[PDB]
């Protein structure tokens, strides 16, 4: 009875716990219970939970994952209940989902840095095995450079894992190049924190020696010195809009576009000149 399942990689995540709160609030508002399950991004786990959720007779599901394959897609379509993706990327774009335009956001961030005089701009992404990184965020980075008539050099792309440590190492990696970047854009705020501190551990001054821009605008953006300039992602809203869109599907009300892109923007603080 009136219950929806929520598959999420890790509820203890600063990002996913916020998305989850947004989902729950709208779920409470509309009288829906929430069965929460963690997947750790394990495909077998995700597909299994999907069938497991059905066993509990859920009325719908909100799915969050960093690797949506054609197999996930088919499973989502054949599921007897409505499914909505939140903060996730599905290249095929067939499953209703709510997120922002990651490609544009990164593009905007890079363009900004370019308009400021940067030629050697670096991008610290999340695992390239995830479409959101390799197919969206990296593409916005590529497009911005190409549009500014700048070459795309792999050396200016470091691969992190969303972890604070990866950001620390990401920075030390990039500063090891013969030609270091003068600006660094991180696919995440937590990695951006590591970059800033690693830069400072090596004696560099932010924003002086290096312009740094994060991505998401989580509270972590304010808990750093200098405070992080970041791309804003209405994380709570994505969860809310996702659950709300799901309730429309479950109550068969009119759906104007199943693929929703909430607006983004850039909050400039002190990590950029």
């Amino acid at each position: 009875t009136t219950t929806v399942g929520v598959i999420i990689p890790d509820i203890s995540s600063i990002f996913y716990s916020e998305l989850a709160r947004g989902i729950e609030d709208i779920a409470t508002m509309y009288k829906y219970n929430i069965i929460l399950s963690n997947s750790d991004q394990n495909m077998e786990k995700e597909l299994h939970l999907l069938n497991t959720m059905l066993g509990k007779q859920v009325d719908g599901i909100v799915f969050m994952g960093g690797n949506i394959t054609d197999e996930h897609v088919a499973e989502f379509k054949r599921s007897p209940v409505p499914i909505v993706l939140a903060a996730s990327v599905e290249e095929q774009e067939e499953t209703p989902s709510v997120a922002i335009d990651y490609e544009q956001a990164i593009y905007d961030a890079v363009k900004l840095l370019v308009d400021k005089g940067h030629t050697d701009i670096a991008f610290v992404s999340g695992p390239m095995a995830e479409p959101i990184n390799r197919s969206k965020k990296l593409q916005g980075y590529k497009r911005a450079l190409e549009e500014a008539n700048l070459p795309f050099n792999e050396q200016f792309v470091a691969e992190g894992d969303y972890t604070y440590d990866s950001g620390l190492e990401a920075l030390q990696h990039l500063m090891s190049l013969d030609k270091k970047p003068t600006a660094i854009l991180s696919a995440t705020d937590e990695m951006a924190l590591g970059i800033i501190h690693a830069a400072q551990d090596q004696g560099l001054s932010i924003p002086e020696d290096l312009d740094i821009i994060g991505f998401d605008n989580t509270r972590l953006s304010l808990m750093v010195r200098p405070q992080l300039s970041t791309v804003v992602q209405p994380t709570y809203d994505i969860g809310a809009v996702a659950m709300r869109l799901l309730t429309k599907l479950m109550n068969k009300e009119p759906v104007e576009e199943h693929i929703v892109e909430l607006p983004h923007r850039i909050e400039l603080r002190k990590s950029t000149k």
Partner: protein, 87 residues
């Protein structure tokens, strides 16, 4: 019923505070709208409201036509400051 405000909250019209305002507008039969940048949405619609992406510093207008329109605008005005969103 109608009144314009200027968002003060740093997070603009988003997250929990946005949900609260929407839940307030829903407690009335009157049509409650939210005008911003020439785009008008149902203030009782989570998707409509959050889709506007209202940042700090913006100016919005809350409408309301119906029986309880006056009560609506009164409750919303309260939520706007109650939730420290704007004035």
């Amino acid at each position: 019923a109608q009144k314009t405000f200027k968002v003060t909250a740093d997070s603009g019209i988003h997250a929990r505070p946005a949900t609260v305002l929407v839940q307030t507008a829903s407690k009335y039969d009157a049509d409650v709208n939210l005008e911003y940048n020439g785009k008008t949405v149902n203030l009782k619609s989570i998707m409509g409201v959050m889709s506007l992406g209202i940042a700090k510093g913006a100016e919005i207008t809350i409408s309301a036509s119906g029986a309880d329109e006056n009560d609506a605008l009164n409750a919303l005005e309260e939520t706007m400051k109650s939730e420290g969103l704007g004035e």
